[PDB]
Amino acid sequence: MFQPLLDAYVESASIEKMASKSPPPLKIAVANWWGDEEIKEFKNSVLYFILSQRYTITLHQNPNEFSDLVFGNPLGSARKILSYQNAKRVFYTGENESPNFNLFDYAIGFDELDFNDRYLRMPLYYDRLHHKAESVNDTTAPYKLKDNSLYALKKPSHCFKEKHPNLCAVVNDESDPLKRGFASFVASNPNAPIRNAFYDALNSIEPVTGGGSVRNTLGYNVKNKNEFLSQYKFNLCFENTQGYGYVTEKIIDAYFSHTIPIYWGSPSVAKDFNPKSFVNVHDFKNFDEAIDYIKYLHTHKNAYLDMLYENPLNTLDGKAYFYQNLSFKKILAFFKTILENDTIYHDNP
Amino acid sequence: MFQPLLDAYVESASIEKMASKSPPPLKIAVANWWGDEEIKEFKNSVLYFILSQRYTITLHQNPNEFSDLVFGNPQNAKRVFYTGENESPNFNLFDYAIGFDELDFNDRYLRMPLYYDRLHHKAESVNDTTAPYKLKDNSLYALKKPSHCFKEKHPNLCAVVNDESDPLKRGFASFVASNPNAPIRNAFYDALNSIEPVTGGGSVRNTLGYNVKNKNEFLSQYKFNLCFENTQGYGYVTEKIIDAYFSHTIPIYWGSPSVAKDFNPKSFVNVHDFKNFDEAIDYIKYLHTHKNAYLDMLYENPLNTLDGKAYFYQNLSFKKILAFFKTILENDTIYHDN
């Protein structure tokens, strides 16, 4: 049930509207090799989106320019130059990699760590929600955006349904969720010793439908991931690697496509999402046993519809919440503190 | 006043004397990068000393031998980061880390600054029948047979601590450094060298034509000790300030800007509290010419006190360190990259 997760997300994006377009300049240095595509992707990310609500952002790719923040995680030659901008450095990557606090003053990541003002946890799933929120500011979408909220203020598109018929049909109670294939699987890397032992074991209850390169079954890689996952009862949602707190956009795609995620990745995922809403493979002593609970859910429609209908988020006294209250306000406070703090924390020899 | 610091240290070293039990074998590998003197230092560290109270340790450097833990500093064994440098841990490479950073990473990180290891060493050196500082009878550090040489090696220190001399009746400020890659420390030195001359007993800015043999005896001869860390790190408080307290001299400190969390600010000059060096020096001048204020500072407890008890920040103790390692040994998780 995506709608309540989206509602919670939209509320977490609630902040005071800034008055009369006087957003102070913020100069951010980013990867020098980024081309116009990567730049476009960055101007579309939730971090940029959030910051644009309070600053007039300029991006810098010239190494001989001063900046307010140097952003990212350069490697090789570009990591050396970083050492010299001795600018206010902020570590940020989509990879399962913890920050180097000798080189970076501040960091935004997935680790469950407290370093006072120097670190903020902003999992990748928050950014995927931002993209799902934008894609449904469409007049044909089956998910609704609170009137007048930040995501509803830009003009809406009209392509969603044409692009996600099946998804719309089932979200719109015009199809029966029980009347679907067993499970979808979309992945690009074959080497995943833990994932395969699991695909082989899931793929031996009923065939698993593959839409990506690994274990493909359709004979072609699916065009729209979300439309494809909505055609199955479950979605094989294993992260590429394990990290405590490392919850990617994958589980969000399952929720969004109205299918039950079968999750494995961060052993603490239950902190971020309601475990009654997905098969948390970590809540079992072995796969063997988890395969059995999936086998059960697949043949006991009541338990299956129970899970599909749980709020993706945990609740405390009826109010749904993001773990540690992640929100636009929390993220903007973190940046206002970084910008106003003149202390140099990185190695400055 | 080192005595109260030692008392709190000895108390922090108190552990249950499980005797019905026996220390189980614990196999510890050290990385190859580690030189023989880095291995000798480790064998002599307070961490090794603490662990040896609950485990029968075997330390080796054979990467072919299955071990319970492996210690390094930049396999499928649990790796523990441990270094003396002002270097934050790489958690991609190490499952666990012992450091100085003010960080909380649940069971993966433990703060144990080098000053705690320097206290361990001073405590041993004072298990000596001619020593000016006392160790509670029946404490861990008093169990071994003592030495009889302390006074001989530190006459002046015993005199002042033994009240056979007057604290005010001494030189101005000592400075013992041998590292030159420390610009801020030099600039502060040249600036302090103004109130009066600052006697230099080490390589760097050496005064008396030679290097002193006993750092502590020497420091006990001055009213203050110029106590600068080589670089700034939040939480990076080394052995230096402990040498000042041990030598019954006022530390003039710079290094960790959060040093007041670890030590009682009324007990030393914290250069970080001033907007510029000039202002810090003005304060030093004042202490040097106001006997009541100087003595007050010299007699303060080096540690902060709360609820009637002197304490180490965040309750650093043998028990805290033993629980951290017990948790590592019992947890099968491997966090490092593979």
Side-chain angles (χ1 to χ4, degrees), chain B residues 228-239:
Chain B
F228 271 45
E229 305 288 6
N230 291 312
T231 52
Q232 174 176 295
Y234 278 73
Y236 189 61
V237 183
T238 73
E239 69 283 342

PDB file of all heavy atoms in Angstrom, chain B residues 228-239:
ATOM      1  N   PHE B 228      51.424  21.487  24.033  1.00  0.00           N
ATOM      2  CA  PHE B 228      50.688  21.487  22.762  1.00  0.00           C
ATOM      3  C   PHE B 228      50.681  20.144  22.025  1.00  0.00           C
ATOM      4  O   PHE B 228      51.717  19.507  21.884  1.00  0.00           O
ATOM      5  CB  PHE B 228      51.263  22.532  21.772  1.00  0.00           C
ATOM      6  CG  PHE B 228      50.653  23.907  21.866  1.00  0.00           C
ATOM      7  CD1 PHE B 228      50.439  24.523  23.084  1.00  0.00           C
ATOM      8  CD2 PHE B 228      50.258  24.582  20.701  1.00  0.00           C
ATOM      9  CE1 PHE B 228      49.807  25.811  23.167  1.00  0.00           C
ATOM     10  CE2 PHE B 228      49.640  25.844  20.755  1.00  0.00           C
ATOM     11  CZ  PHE B 228      49.404  26.468  21.997  1.00  0.00           C
ATOM     12  N   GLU B 229      49.502  19.694  21.572  1.00  0.00           N
ATOM     13  CA  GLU B 229      49.469  18.449  20.787  1.00  0.00           C
ATOM     14  C   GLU B 229      50.073  18.866  19.455  1.00  0.00           C
ATOM     15  O   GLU B 229      50.106  20.054  19.152  1.00  0.00           O
ATOM     16  CB  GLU B 229      48.030  17.974  20.515  1.00  0.00           C
ATOM     17  CG  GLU B 229      47.152  17.792  21.798  1.00  0.00           C
ATOM     18  CD  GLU B 229      47.538  16.575  22.635  1.00  0.00           C
ATOM     19  OE1 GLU B 229      48.558  15.914  22.304  1.00  0.00           O
ATOM     20  OE2 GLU B 229      46.802  16.294  23.626  1.00  0.00           O
ATOM     21  N   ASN B 230      50.464  17.908  18.635  1.00  0.00           N
ATOM     22  CA  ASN B 230      51.082  18.250  17.338  1.00  0.00           C
ATOM     23  C   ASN B 230      50.077  18.720  16.285  1.00  0.00           C
ATOM     24  O   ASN B 230      50.424  19.426  15.340  1.00  0.00           O
ATOM     25  CB  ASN B 230      51.890  17.067  16.870  1.00  0.00           C
ATOM     26  CG  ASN B 230      53.108  16.853  17.746  1.00  0.00           C
ATOM     27  OD1 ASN B 230      53.858  17.817  18.025  1.00  0.00           O
ATOM     28  ND2 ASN B 230      53.327  15.608  18.194  1.00  0.00           N
ATOM     29  N   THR B 231      48.814  18.365  16.482  1.00  0.00           N
ATOM     30  CA  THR B 231      47.738  18.788  15.562  1.00  0.00           C
ATOM     31  C   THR B 231      46.420  18.815  16.359  1.00  0.00           C
ATOM     32  O   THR B 231      46.339  18.179  17.402  1.00  0.00           O
ATOM     33  CB  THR B 231      47.534  17.780  14.371  1.00  0.00           C
ATOM     34  OG1 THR B 231      47.379  16.457  14.873  1.00  0.00           O
ATOM     35  CG2 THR B 231      48.688  17.785  13.419  1.00  0.00           C
ATOM     36  N   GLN B 232      45.428  19.525  15.840  1.00  0.00           N
ATOM     37  CA  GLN B 232      44.107  19.633  16.434  1.00  0.00           C
ATOM     38  C   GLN B 232      43.199  18.520  15.930  1.00  0.00           C
ATOM     39  O   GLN B 232      43.151  18.202  14.706  1.00  0.00           O
ATOM     40  CB  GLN B 232      43.473  20.971  16.083  1.00  0.00           C
ATOM     41  CG  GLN B 232      41.960  21.189  16.524  1.00  0.00           C
ATOM     42  CD  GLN B 232      41.433  22.612  16.216  1.00  0.00           C
ATOM     43  OE1 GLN B 232      41.920  23.600  16.796  1.00  0.00           O
ATOM     44  NE2 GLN B 232      40.418  22.724  15.307  1.00  0.00           N
ATOM     45  N   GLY B 233      42.544  17.883  16.884  1.00  0.00           N
ATOM     46  CA  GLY B 233      41.549  16.848  16.575  1.00  0.00           C
ATOM     47  C   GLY B 233      40.522  16.925  17.721  1.00  0.00           C
ATOM     48  O   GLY B 233      40.934  17.042  18.890  1.00  0.00           O
ATOM     49  N   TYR B 234      39.216  16.877  17.434  1.00  0.00           N
ATOM     50  CA  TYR B 234      38.259  16.925  18.553  1.00  0.00           C
ATOM     51  C   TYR B 234      38.346  15.588  19.263  1.00  0.00           C
ATOM     52  O   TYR B 234      38.036  14.562  18.672  1.00  0.00           O
ATOM     53  CB  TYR B 234      36.799  17.230  18.063  1.00  0.00           C
ATOM     54  CG  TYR B 234      36.594  18.704  17.850  1.00  0.00           C
ATOM     55  CD1 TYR B 234      37.165  19.347  16.767  1.00  0.00           C
ATOM     56  CD2 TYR B 234      35.865  19.472  18.772  1.00  0.00           C
ATOM     57  CE1 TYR B 234      37.025  20.700  16.598  1.00  0.00           C
ATOM     58  CE2 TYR B 234      35.718  20.818  18.615  1.00  0.00           C
ATOM     59  CZ  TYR B 234      36.298  21.432  17.513  1.00  0.00           C
ATOM     60  OH  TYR B 234      36.083  22.777  17.306  1.00  0.00           O
ATOM     61  N   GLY B 235      38.844  15.611  20.509  1.00  0.00           N
ATOM     62  CA  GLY B 235      38.935  14.400  21.336  1.00  0.00           C
ATOM     63  C   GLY B 235      40.381  13.878  21.383  1.00  0.00           C
ATOM     64  O   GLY B 235      40.673  12.958  22.148  1.00  0.00           O
ATOM     65  N   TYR B 236      41.257  14.462  20.565  1.00  0.00           N
ATOM     66  CA  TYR B 236      42.644  13.989  20.465  1.00  0.00           C
ATOM     67  C   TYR B 236      43.495  14.546  21.633  1.00  0.00           C
ATOM     68  O   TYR B 236      44.179  15.545  21.484  1.00  0.00           O
ATOM     69  CB  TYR B 236      43.298  14.402  19.097  1.00  0.00           C
ATOM     70  CG  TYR B 236      44.654  13.737  18.881  1.00  0.00           C
ATOM     71  CD1 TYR B 236      44.743  12.364  18.832  1.00  0.00           C
ATOM     72  CD2 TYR B 236      45.836  14.478  18.719  1.00  0.00           C
ATOM     73  CE1 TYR B 236      45.939  11.700  18.643  1.00  0.00           C
ATOM     74  CE2 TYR B 236      47.082  13.804  18.508  1.00  0.00           C
ATOM     75  CZ  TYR B 236      47.107  12.421  18.483  1.00  0.00           C
ATOM     76  OH  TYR B 236      48.261  11.671  18.332  1.00  0.00           O
ATOM     77  N   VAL B 237      43.430  13.900  22.785  1.00  0.00           N
ATOM     78  CA  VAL B 237      44.134  14.381  23.962  1.00  0.00           C
ATOM     79  C   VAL B 237      45.109  13.273  24.258  1.00  0.00           C
ATOM     80  O   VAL B 237      44.699  12.121  24.580  1.00  0.00           O
ATOM     81  CB  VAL B 237      43.177  14.545  25.155  1.00  0.00           C
ATOM     82  CG1 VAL B 237      43.924  15.119  26.347  1.00  0.00           C
ATOM     83  CG2 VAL B 237      42.073  15.451  24.785  1.00  0.00           C
ATOM     84  N   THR B 238      46.396  13.591  24.147  1.00  0.00           N
ATOM     85  CA  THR B 238      47.388  12.557  24.325  1.00  0.00           C
ATOM     86  C   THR B 238      48.016  12.471  25.736  1.00  0.00           C
ATOM     87  O   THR B 238      47.437  12.934  26.730  1.00  0.00           O
ATOM     88  CB  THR B 238      48.532  12.711  23.217  1.00  0.00           C
ATOM     89  OG1 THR B 238      49.365  13.850  23.506  1.00  0.00           O
ATOM     90  CG2 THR B 238      47.879  12.973  21.821  1.00  0.00           C
ATOM     91  N   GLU B 239      49.215  11.881  25.779  1.00  0.00           N
ATOM     92  CA  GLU B 239      49.944  11.701  27.023  1.00  0.00           C
ATOM     93  C   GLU B 239      50.464  12.990  27.598  1.00  0.00           C
ATOM     94  O   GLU B 239      50.713  13.037  28.804  1.00  0.00           O
ATOM     95  CB  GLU B 239      51.163  10.812  26.806  1.00  0.00           C
ATOM     96  CG  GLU B 239      52.240  11.507  25.968  1.00  0.00           C
ATOM     97  CD  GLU B 239      51.889  11.521  24.446  1.00  0.00           C
ATOM     98  OE1 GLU B 239      51.003  10.721  23.987  1.00  0.00           O
ATOM     99  OE2 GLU B 239      52.532  12.320  23.719  1.00  0.00           O
TER     100      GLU B 239
END
